[model samples]
Target chain A: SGFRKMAFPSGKVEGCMVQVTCGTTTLNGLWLDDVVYCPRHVICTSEDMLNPNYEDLLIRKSNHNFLVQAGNVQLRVIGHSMQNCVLKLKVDTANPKTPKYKFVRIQPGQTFSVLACYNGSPSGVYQCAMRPNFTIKGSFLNGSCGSVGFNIDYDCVSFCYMHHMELPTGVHAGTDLEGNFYGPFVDRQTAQAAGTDTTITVNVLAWLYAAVINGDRWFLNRFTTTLNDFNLVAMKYNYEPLTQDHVDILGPLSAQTGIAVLDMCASLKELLQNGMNGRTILGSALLEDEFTPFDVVRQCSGVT
Target chain B: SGFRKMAFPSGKVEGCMVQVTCGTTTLNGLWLDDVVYCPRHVICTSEDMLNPNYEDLLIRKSNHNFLVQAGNVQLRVIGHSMQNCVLKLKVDTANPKTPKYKFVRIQPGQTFSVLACYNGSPSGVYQCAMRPNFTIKGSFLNGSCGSVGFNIDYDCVSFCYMHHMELPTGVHAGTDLEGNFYGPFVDRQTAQAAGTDTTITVNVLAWLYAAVINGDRWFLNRFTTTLNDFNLVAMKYNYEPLTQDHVDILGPLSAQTGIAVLDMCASLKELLQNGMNGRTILGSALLEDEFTPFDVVRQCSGVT
Candidate 1:
């Protein structure tokens, strides 16, 4: 009964089913089989996919002239007829992988504009596609549909980058005071002192004769063998280190371990110093009595 | 011990209690003597009272207007110089009996002008009195000193006199064709017949007989007793009466008697009608009913 053959003209369902694929993954059962189901599933789908009531398609070029400023780039849609319609922006010619990031819904009888800031990675060719909700199925297709597609000069300035540097023993080079070679590893006393009074100058001198250190950069760079000149120059100043009671009690597990810890402490110190104002420094001696596993053991022995 | 009369210009311990006569009334007490109670009471009554702090005086007026109108009438004292300061009204005045009635407070730096319409019983002369509290003695002067009176033209049309006609006898006469009266008043049979598919008409002959024999001209003369005529006409047309069972049951007593019951019923009917429109009649009918005693045995017995 489900598969009965009919006449020469076959029958088909009225509604269209759109397959929403996110990256390489397809979302099927979550939504209806229409363009409206794409937004929640896709990474950056246009607003039209969710709202079928849109009219105009807007293509915002990340023009080179506009990319230099950290401000919004806007576009205006004119005419009352175009209002009450959805404006969809697609990235890289309708490719779902490079989807449009924003969509706007314009009300009827309103003259308004939208600003689309260049939030995408870099300079790239972006395209736009526009489709109306209603369409004629058969022939007799006149020019009743609206047009889409516009181009603009785009040059995305490099706004973000990854920074990398190195420092050797007794040398400090950190964001604090600039070019002082000390970091990646710092002594526990200096770390504790820096922790007490965040404004304390954390240079190589601060970590002169302290025990243990801990930090992200220190943990990452603890295994390096070479006596890097960058590290030596960086360690020249007395720098604050990230404190670890256990490390201090246990002593250095490895030679270069404190280096990364000191580096992380120095980086954090620099960030704190620059980011915030009105800070002070306390002496490192305050950390001498900090409890550790070794101290617990010693207490237990004394009790026995 | 209270007072040692040292000396007066006359150098005598002689005290005189003088009383001045104005027309038929005698003016006595401390006001009669120029230096009354000189030795002990040094207080002197002056005709001129000092003016109060202008700001306090102004704020009091604003607050009064605010509470009365619920902030509907915004009164702001403009200009530093009181000579040119003007207080203006922006909104139309509402019924004073209603919660929205508000009058501007008189203050310094305010040039007061009459705006909008007065709620009820508009007087030709409006008095703006400045009884500034807390700083000066109370006085009643005219114009800018004590009380300022302005003439205002009343601008309200008289309502139609016929609209307040009393309810007629019989269900049809006093009621709509749908068997519903102007208020809740209905014939005993009709009330019993509610929700039933039946038509009830007043026995017109019975009403005419009662009016003639009982001298119940209250529901007869049309020109002079417009309310009674209305009721009679409604009764002739089988309309419902205005007085409900509760009112009719207790109408024969009191100065207004059953007539008072009918009047109350008519008033309520008018109120309900007006309420259907936009008019808001404040004060509760609950209190009215409570104050109305149940002492109409004659009408109750007759009707039954």
Candidate 2:
């Protein structure tokens, strides 16, 4: 659905908070031809419909079995079955069959830095579409699009391309990456050729949006947009604006967007209070003390 | 060469046990790389130069391409080369280049393991020399360098294949685990992850002939000759027969790509033992039918 009011443990405050339900809220499907419902989001940002937390959470991540480590983009994909496959995790520009550009062409289980799709202009979206068997039974086993589903807004239609940092979330960065760098680093001088700085960052807000700000995060039921208000921090980076493509794919970036985003904001808090298992990740509560996306929003919105 | 005295193979030799040796015996060199030997001791639990277990059957897993885990203290090396030199190639915890670890920068090569520095220093010792090149070249950091030598068990370096998994070993948590976390951990984690009952029973004995122990298990290799009355089985883990500095570069990869960056491969044992066919495990005949670090000792030394 769209946005809804927050219902906390203390009481039911209608207008105070809003959330966009995900999970059992499944659009729960990867699209294209046949591969029915590919559990896109399990632990959605909102309730799993029946419970406070997503009980039958389906993980879409398991779909990404291969990873590519290029200079700036570190990504994972499922490359076991077919060819002409493009796994998600990048800017979505609306290019399904072809695109403006395909900057990277990597293999399964490999490493990279700066690759090239050097095809043309940047696609409105990053397409990870492979040709799977036409039949769901045979298709899935072989990894065909018919079975695996193409990630699309529908047609060549797609979300916008806001290529800039911020507007959504920031990551926990610092040398904290331990081995390699992951968070985000937009600075890679064309110089420093041999040494100095290597690693590159990931796609801007667009990718972050679906994963964090207002997408799977809600899908997860506990997504916090930022440690701080994104809009303020986003001002520091140079970003693009929402184009008609974004509006076309997502409908309207105004109230619906706000409803969706806030829906998650509302539900995430409720889910947390109700105790979703993702909280106990790796062992302890996943979020030690960091603020959530809604915390910033709640602050911006005002007291209950 | 894989041994010394009676090692374990039968009975539940549990709890407060006693024993010895490791570190002193160094011949750690991965095979193929230069045929400079190769780090063999397929299951290097206190390796064997004079023992039958090693004499009769050497593993030479050109396939494994990785090593296991163990603690420290038992190290070996030579004193020839120069006056001082370090070894091994590590991801400069911070800087990651110019191999300064110069010691124990162990690598997993094709096979063998006796490895030498045809191109070496972490033998538990150091080595370096020079002609008139720079009579002042005393430190391994100096440019005034000559060929090299490992203390039989020292360090030189490169890199190899990388893998991933979670159970006892996870690399993508808050910390990105490397090497040690890879090997031998199969034994410790479950006990640790299980809690309370933690004293793990190990052939982590015979002082793996290459690493340090919580105490001295080597005293037992000589002890196994007595403990099992002769059946031999002391096993050791943590070990690397190579290093860096006045080092050896395995040469380059392609005329184009880049030079060889020696890599390290590590793993756990339960997975190994359960399949060593899992013989040398707890609660049963540690080595059911296989031999121990010193099973060759009696067969080679004399009769039962």
Candidate 3:
């Protein structure tokens, strides 16, 4: 009853978040909050799908008892466990049920990080900043034993900073609005072991997105290769690369932006040598302020 | 933020249950519920201590950032994880906060199962059914990683009968009022791996307590020894025994009850060969039916 009680909610909430960690699997549903709420099943009924705030619940109508869904926001998964497990990102639209998008299968010891963003205007027009690189778009994703998912909304920032001293990593550091000395830290294990907490794990994705949009090759080169290597060893359940679709989503920018995109391609290519470790994470107007909006605006968008 | 969010609750609830599992730690606080709620800190303030329901919150005031506390009904801990870690049960009542009772320290790979029950009336004569065995009584108990805790009220029953057929390691299966096949299964790993879930993990304790009271050695012997062995291996973080204090709390019974108490002593002794694993789990009149109330009365008291 301990595990069952926590997994199945007696009552459901629209914006209430669910987080469950069990013997071999971890599930994070809906939004983010400070409390631990484990809701075994997250449902998006037909009415729920019709609402703009909830349309991302499912790409199509299907019932397979999904563990988590990446709807209006971004869904982040981490291979943070000591063991290896499988992960599945899938969807079924038509009868006889088939995956309209490519299905994701996570292999052993593979570092994996991908964001899923869905924004469809059933009645109105809404333009996205860029088209995602990969075709892995769906309302449902499941992770086998040994994987964990974080279903986060836009604007939640992941910061990595040492409180009293400075981190050993040489990544250029910056200051946040809170006056905290913030910067990217390599070596997830080392930094985490040090007890200094931050959202750098997913924040790096935000950082790179900012760099690519503004043609900051210098910043991109400085952090991209190191991050790619880190992703290779540290994340080992499902790790993939971002491609041309991701980089050129809002492309045809300055030749500088072009070179930075190549850097992304190169960084993404090496990331794939280990396996199918990349995918396009969709973004939308709803997420106009996502991925550490404050820091990205202050530090990366034509700022220091 | 995912793990952190689930671990720390922004708001607190008097009866809300908090469940959290991280890299190396698992925490359950306050009460039980269906939704997963993780509260980093579970507090019973000075005012809360006046309330009978919450006084069990602390035997003494000390700050060690405990993972969970055994207050009110019962606190149950299990070596449920696949790994081997440490478990600590301690309290500091006096200045420089020292334990009036013995402190518990769990060793590696040791099968462990213990219940901590606290019921003290500050100003009223609230008599408990019995004083617990071993002297490990405290409000704060911490499980270092790989261990989990369940702070359940007295009425929650852990039923373990086959949904359709039956289980392997049989121990006189009975029927709950719900018409469910209610019996004790020996192997935790086997039953859990098979997905045939039950409260047998903690319910066994409840079953034994009932057997001891009624002087039913036949019932006690049938389940006690097997449960003892299972505790020896399946629970591998901290496993200990019950003693005269636990068996004779409501003592001076029929020689039959006496013999059953001796059997308890024997079962508890063998359980100790592995280490300092046994302690008295306090119980109160409030917990007259702590285990499985429906089945215990009809099956153990006399009906069956």
Candidate 4:
């Protein structure tokens, strides 16, 4: 069970073992008395095929030395390396109560990934090397939000500290950007200039919005609980809260976003009369005496 | 060709990686921040997958310290560890013409292998620690075989070396042992006095011997040249020479060995009168009067 010895042949009684080779081939024969004949046994020197080198079977890739730099924001650059690396960084702010932040693990062939957790606090990262040559610089890892981190695998070698000024937290006070994601929190001037093109998705959202704005209690009740019904549409795609960004990737979240009464009214005018719905709904001037929501209701209630 | 990275959903991304059990699962969605969705990307907090560890994935067999003890012949024990090991040993006898040797590499949980070419005729052995718990004693490697060598994953801890006295080289000068391997090189006394008892292989060799003796040139011409054609027999087995040893392992050409040539003549008489290929030649009769090479021939060509 432990060690075993399989005895071999000797020269006197049990003839000795003789081996011979011709180039790479082992000639077969016997070594009888003085003559060596047919069929050689073991090559005795075939160490290459029967045996292999360790380096030939190890992980092969240049180390990427991932590092982190700080400012108000944290920028992490993963040095090009083999693959799948993990590093832990701690963020410390002047106030201990400041919330923590995060960054994803470094993956091979990865370019860059960033996170806002480090804030304008004091922070640093930590590492454990898996390779014999791997090394981590402890001097860079002070664990402060304002401090930067550096690693061997990820390309980011030196992280700079940038105390990014805080973002303005006022509604519509947000700098208006094209999509609802930005405008939802951006200021007005930005929203007023976006291209609200008449597309199918746009028309669909417009229809829903207008239907409720007509002062119809039926539609409003449906709208409030609409989030639940949205699963059918969302599940078919990359599923998100029925928003415009969802439309971009998962295909029209049935025409995005949230904008109350006024936007709905305008979109309805486009869908019903300007041909945004393939063809305008009903006639261009269906509300003969159109005055307000009352007129919208009458037109909807078969007063056509 | 070198490296590849498959982007995963920041929650909504398609998953090709499976995490059976570790931490939290990547639910169908990424944690939605105030901004940033998909082509939404990068859910990082890496699970140290890439930054690998040697021990974390190697053969974790406990450290069985390997040691060696020797006198004349070298004895080595590479207490099994991970493959890709390198050792240096010296072989030195009486001359300065000794050379060095090196095995392929290292590995653990493997089988047994030996070395001899690595010494300068009288040099000893050397040791290095790939790990902390491993230990190779200071004895045995007496440096007589003044050379050095190394090898890959075989775990023999203690090597016991007892100086083997040299054996005298002689033919059939052996004690009667059952194995044909020994008998081939033994003297007449050893062959005739052997157990020759209960076994298949040895008996089969004996049976063929018995059949040919009874005046059959069909088998005798086949015997001398049989020794010649026997090389054909040897080449066919381990694809080595005519030896059962080759069938078991390798090295050596001692299979069809020692025997009493006269014994065949006796058997030939019995077979001529009774069995194999009908009649026996008249001339080779019961040794009645004359004996010559002609008698041996008449026994073959069916010369009745």
Question: What does candidate 2's lDDT look like per residue over B1-304, in tens digits?
Answer: 1121111110011010111111332222211111111222222343342242432333342222222111222212211111111112111122111221122322212111111111111110111111111111111211111112211111222222111112222121000012222232221113223122111112222112111111112112211122221112113321212223101321111111221212100112332223233122221212221122222222222221
lDDT of 1 at A150: 16
Interface RMSD, one decimal, each candidate: 54.3, 32.8, 25.1, 45.1
Q: Over 4 Å off in model 4, which ranges?
A: A1-115, A119-163, A166-304, B1-304
lDDT value, residue A256 of candidate 2: 29
Q: Tell me what fraction of the real C-alpha contacts between chains A and B each candidate also makes.
A: 0.00, 0.00, 0.00, 0.00
Candidate 3 chain B: minimum summed lDDT over ten consecutive residues — where?
B1-10
lDDT of 1 by residue, A27-110 (tens): 211011111211121222344344322222222222221111111222121211111121122211122222222222211111
DockQ score of the complex predicted as candidate 3: 0.01
Standalone chain B TM-score for every prediction = 0.15, 0.16, 0.20, 0.16
Residue-level lDDT of model 2, residues A1-304, one tens digit each, is 0011111111010001111112222111121121111212222333332232222333332333222222233323322221111112222222122312212222111111100010111101011111011000010100111111111111121211111111111111111101111223221211111112211111122222223422234334344443134333323332212233332333222232353443333333443345334332212222211112232232122222
After superposing candidate 1 on the true structure, give the runs of residues whose Cα lies further than 4 Å from its correct spot.
A1-304, B1-228, B232-239, B242-249, B252-262, B265-269, B272-304
Give the poorly placed runs of model 2, Cα more than 4 Å off: A1-304, B1-184, B187-304
Instruction: Tell the DockQ for candidate 4.
Output: 0.00
Candidate No. with top lDDT: 3
Candidate 1, residues B1-304: lDDT per residue as tens digits? 0000000011000011112121222211111111211000001112211222433444433312311122123222121112111122222332232211112222211111110011110101111111111011111111111111111112111110000011121111111111122233222222222122111111121222222233333332212223454466445433444334433333344233334434443443342233213111111111011011211121122110
Candidate 3 structure quality by residue, lDDT tens digits, A1-304: 0000000011111122323333233444222232122222123333432332222333432323333332233333321111011112222211121112111222111111112111110100000110121111111112211111221112122211111111232111212112222223221113411222222223234444554553333323332454455445334423334333433432333232444444553443343343212222221101111233223332222110
RMSD of each: 39.3, 29.7, 25.4, 41.7
